[PDB]
Amino acid sequence: AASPAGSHMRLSELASYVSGKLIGEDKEIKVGIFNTLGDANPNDIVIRHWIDEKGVEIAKNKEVSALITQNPKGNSLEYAKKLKVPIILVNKIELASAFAIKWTIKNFAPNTYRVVITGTNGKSTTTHMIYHILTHAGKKAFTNTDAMVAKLLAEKAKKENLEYLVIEVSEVDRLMKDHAYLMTKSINPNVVVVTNVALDHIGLVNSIEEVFEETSGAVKALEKGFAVLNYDNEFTRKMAKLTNKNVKVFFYGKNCPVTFKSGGIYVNNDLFIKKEELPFKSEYFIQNTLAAISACLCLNIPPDIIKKGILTYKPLKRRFSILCKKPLIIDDFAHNPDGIKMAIKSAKKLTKNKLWVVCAIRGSRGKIINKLNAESLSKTLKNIENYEVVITNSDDVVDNLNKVKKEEEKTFLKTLEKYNINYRFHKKLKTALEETLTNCKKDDTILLIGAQGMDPASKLLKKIKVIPC
Ligand SMILES: O=c1ccn([C@@H]2O[C@H](COP(=O)(O)OP(=O)(O)O)[C@@H](O)[C@H]2O)c(=O)[nH]1
- The strand ranges marked E within 52-197 are 66-72, 87-90, 113-118, 141-143, 164-168, 191-194
| Alpha-carbon gap, residue 294 to 156, rounded angstroms | 26
Q: Choose the residue to mutate in 58, 85, 87, 152 for probing ligand 1, maximizing ligand atoms within 8 Å of C-beta.
A: 58
Q: Return the amino acid letter for 196.
A: N
| Alpha-carbon gap, residue 227 to 122, rounded angstroms | 16
Closest residue CA from atom 13 of ligand 1: 38
Cβ–Cβ contacts within 10 Å for residue 175, how many? 16
- Rounded to 10 degrees, the C-alpha dihedral 29/35/39/44 comes to -10
Q: What order do you get walking across the sheet with 226-230 strand by strand?
A: 141-143, 164-168, 113-118, 191-194, 226-230, 248-252, 258-261, 264-267, 270-273
Give φ, ψ of 91 to 5 degrees. Answer: -85, -25
Distance 76 CA to ligand 1 centre (A): 14
| Alpha-carbon gap, residue 388 to 294, rounded angstroms | 38
Q: Return the amino acid letter for 272.
A: F
- The number of CA neighbours under 13 Å toward the Cβ of 30 is 5
Report DSSP state, residue 402.
G
Experimental method: X-ray
Q: What is the resolution of this structure in A?
A: 2.0
Region for residue 145 given its phi and psi (left: phi exceeds 0; alpha: psi -120 to 50; beta: otherwise): beta
Sorted by where each begins, the domain ranges of the chain are 96-312, 321-464
- The number of CA neighbours under 13 Å toward the Cβ of 283 is 21
Contacts of 385 (CB under 8 A, 6+ apart): none
Closest CA to 278 of 350, 334, 342: 350
Cβ–Cβ contacts within 10 Å for residue 449, how many? 25
| Alpha-carbon gap, residue 101 to 269, rounded angstroms | 39
Q: Is CATH 3.40.50.720 the right assignment for the domain spanning 321-464?
A: no
Q: What angle do CA 163, 148, 129 make, to 5 degrees?
A: 50
Residue 248's H or E segment, with its range, is strand 248-252
Residue 101's H or E segment, with its range, is helix 93-108
Cβ–Cβ contacts within 10 Å for residue 52, how many? 16
Residue 267's H or E segment, with its range, is strand 264-267
| Alpha-carbon gap, residue 97 to 166, rounded angstroms | 17
Cβ–Cβ contacts within 10 Å for residue 268, how many? 9
Q: What angle do CA 81, 32, 159 make, to 5 degrees?
A: 155
Q: Return the amino acid letter for 190.
A: N
| Alpha-carbon gap, residue 108 to 6, rounded angstroms | 10
Region for residue 438 given its phi and psi (left: phi exceeds 0; alpha: psi -120 to 50; beta: otherwise): alpha
Q: How far is CA 382 from CA 328, 355, 416, 428, in A?
A: 22, 13, 11, 26
| Alpha-carbon gap, residue 108 to 156, rounded angstroms | 9
| Alpha-carbon gap, residue 28 to 201, rounded angstroms | 44
Query: Is there a contact between 128 and 29 (Cβ–Cβ < 8 Å)?
Result: no
Distance 24 CA to ligand 1 centre (A): 22
Region for residue 213 given its phi and psi (left: phi exceeds 0; alpha: psi -120 to 50; beta: otherwise): alpha
Report DSSP state, residue 275.
G
- Grouping H, G, I as helix, E, B as strand and the rest as coil, residue 337 is helix
Contacts of 462 (CB under 8 A, 6+ apart): none
Pairing verdict, β 191-194 and 164-168: unpaired
Closest CA to 385 of 331, 344, 441: 344
Give φ, ψ of 167 to 5 degrees. Answer: -115, 125
Residue 8's H or E segment, with its range, is strand 8-10
Distance 105 CA to ligand 1 centre (A): 26
Nearest atom within ligand 1 for CA of residue 37 = 13
Strand partners, 51: 72
C-alpha of 276 from chain center: 29
| Alpha-carbon gap, residue 255 to 292, rounded angstroms | 17
Q: Name the H helices within 200-336.
A: 201-205, 208-220, 234-238, 283-298, 303-311
Pairing verdict, β 270-273 and 328-332: unpaired
Residue 325's H or E segment, with its range, is strand 321-325
Contacts of 361 (CB under 8 A, 6+ apart): 370, 391, 392, 393, 394, 404, 408, 409, 412, 450, 453
Contacts of 54 (CB under 8 A, 6+ apart): none
Q: How far is CA 351 from CA 358, 441, 465, in A?
A: 15, 12, 23
Q: Choose the residue to mutate in 35, 37, 77 for probing ligand 1, maximizing ligand atoms within 8 Å of C-beta.
A: 37
| Alpha-carbon gap, residue 304 to 415, rounded angstroms | 49
The size of the chain, in residues, is 469
Distance 443 CA to ligand 1 centre (A): 52
| Alpha-carbon gap, residue 59 to 23, rounded angstroms | 15
Report DSSP state, residue 247.
P
Fold of 96-312: UDP-N-acetylmuramoyl-L-alanine:D-glutamate ligase (3.40.1190)
Closest CA to 168 of 124, 137, 135: 124
Q: Give me the numbers of helices (H) and strands (E) for the chain, helices first please.
A: 17, 22
Cβ–Cβ contacts within 10 Å for residue 152, how many? 17
